[PDB]
Amino acid sequence: HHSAGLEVLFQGPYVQAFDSLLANPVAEYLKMSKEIGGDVQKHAEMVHTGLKLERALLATASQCQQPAGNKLSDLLAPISEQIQEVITFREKNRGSKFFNHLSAVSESIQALGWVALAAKPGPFVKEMNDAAMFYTNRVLKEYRDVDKKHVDWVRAYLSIWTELQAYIKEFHTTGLAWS
Amino acid sequence: LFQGPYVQAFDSLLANPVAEYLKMSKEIGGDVQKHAEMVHTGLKLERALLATASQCQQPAGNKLSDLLAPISEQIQEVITFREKNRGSKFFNHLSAVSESIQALGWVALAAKPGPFVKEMNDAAMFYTNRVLKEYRDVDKKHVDWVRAYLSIWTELQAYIKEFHTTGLAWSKT
């Protein structure tokens, strides 16, 4: 029937593989972000939308021929706007009580842009996760023996990019496999 | 970073209704703010699918459903929020959104997308009329919220009529 509209659909193989690797880190990161609240919670919602746009692009690639140099930026404009949204939130909230949490995310979120690389996407995400780790090391120093929910937040966030590296390694090693 | 023709034409029509809806929802807060963030996410996936349609040759059956699977998940997330928040002080605001959000599913139809979105707008209108009955003469922010939300689907219909009147136009090459 038409009144029901678009029913829930099963994800194709590219996204199924992505979800099996990234579901548990993403869920834990979203749980701990809600527990911390404030700016950490607001930022996680933006990261979660970035991840949802990551899956939408993987689905595109599984059914689409890689377009011309210029024509690809038209496909990546939705994910690059979301990456910038996550970055400008940190830039506008420099007075935040959770600045290092905001910095860990803004300085690593560009990892979602691995889909724009035709060579070495894995080392790119490793370098992004090294930047997240610098700021998360500060969160650990401040909260390791004060608030354990911040310690799990750090571990949960960093494993998103560790699990993204495992996904790229298994399926898209030499770059996102376009149709 | 810069948007393609399909999405730029969408933004020309939907940027101001969407912004107004998000600002009013934040003013109301609570469950209305929570729901609007889910609607904004759905609208972002809509744009992503319009960018896919501009550069991609139309897929058949299962290949097409694989493309639509991200947005279908988000539409359902908007719908399950209302079904799980029946004890809400903003139940009609919640109902207005969940009974109309399937308008984002127009991208799946092979014919007549406008009357489909119109029917979703009729459902939004039934419940927004209950928000108006209740909150006009109480708080005019709810009146501005209704006007903002209904105009999203009014401007969507103008986008469909102008560019994708017989169905979503996919790339021919």
Numbering used by the authors:
A (entry chain D): 29 to 207
B (entry chain A): 37 to 209
Authors' text:
Another actin-binding protein implicated in filament disassembly is cyclase-associated protein (CAP). It is conserved in evolution from protozoan parasites through yeasts and plants to animals, and is thus among the small number (<10) of core actin-binding proteins present in all eukaryotes. CAP is a relatively large multidomain protein, which can self-assemble into oligomers, most likely hexamers. Here, we reveal that CAP promotes rapid actin filament disassembly by accelerating pointed end depolymerization of cofilin-decorated actin filaments.
The N-terminal HFD domain of CAP is critical for actin filament disassembly in vitro and in cells. Interestingly, the dimeric HFD domain was able to strongly accelerate actin filament depolymerization at much lower concentration when compared to the monomeric HFD domain. These data demonstrate that the HFD domain is the functionally minimal unit for actin filament pointed end depolymerization, and that its oligomerization decreases the effective protein concentration needed for this activity.
